[PDB]
Design a protein around this ligand. Structure first.
Ligand SMILES: [Ca+2]
Length: 223
């Protein structure tokens, strides 16, 4: 997250870290057994880390649970990032509590102009590199489809939305991929892609979770 703020320990209790020996992507807990992330975050060997604030210090509220199964969307295209969504099943159910909590899936799709909360442990620099240990947060508005398409001609599908600031300075970034975009208390987006981070005229692009609620619900009813 570039241009964000320190969230505050466990104030984003649905945020997970995906770990393969190191943090490599975010995700969102949607019930005690399942995480939603980006398909481009797929790796074998994932441990889900819940209740994290500093990902380099064991602070006392964490639950570390191995994934049993990952399910990349059936129509995921890694070239375009169309359908950039994945489900991860945990080997055992998380214990839900004040610091480890699920986020609601949407009923309706979010509205252009709505301010959403994006979070993660990704890079905090637009130019260069610096990875935080504690979770960072950013409030960012959803941009109109027309503005999104104009920023990324020939690249935006109806399964994507842009959010952020066209002047630059504030965005998600590498290492935030797979994490939540929460708008009116529901998971509306997944950190997916963008050209650089926090550059002018190059807002973040996010998987449009409202398009996937029927796939999510039938998949979790079946696995
Ligand atoms: Ca920790």
């Amino acid at each position: 997250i570039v241009g964000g703020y320190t969230c505050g320990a466990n104030t984003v209790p649905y945020q997970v870290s995906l770990n393969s020996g190191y943090h490599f992507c975010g995700g969102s807990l949607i019930n005690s057994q399942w995480v939603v992330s980006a398909a481009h975050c797929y790796k074998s060997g994932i441990q889900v880390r819940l209740g994290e604030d500093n990902i380099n210090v064991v602070e006392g509220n964490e639950q570390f649970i191995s994934a049993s199964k990952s399910i990349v969307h059936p129509s995921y295209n890694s070239n375009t990032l169309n359908n950039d969504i994945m489900l991860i099943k945990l080997k055992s159910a998380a214990s839900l509590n004040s610091r480890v909590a699920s986020i609601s899936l949407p009923t309706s799709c979010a509205s252009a102009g709505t301010q959403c909360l994006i979070s993660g442990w990704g890079n905090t620099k637009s130019s260069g590199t610096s990875y935080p240990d504690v979770l960072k947060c950013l409030k960012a508005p959803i941009l109109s489809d027309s503005s999104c398409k104009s920023a990324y001609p020939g690249q935006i599908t109806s399964n994507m939305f842009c959010a952020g600031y066209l002047e630059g300075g504030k965005d998600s970034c590498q290492g935030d991929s797979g994490g939540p975009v929460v708008c009116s208390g529901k998971l509306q987006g997944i950190v997916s892609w963008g050209s650089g981070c926090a550059q002018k005229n190059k807002p973040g692009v996010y998987t449009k979770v409202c398009n996937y609620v029927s796939w999510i619900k039938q998949t979790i009813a079946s696995n």
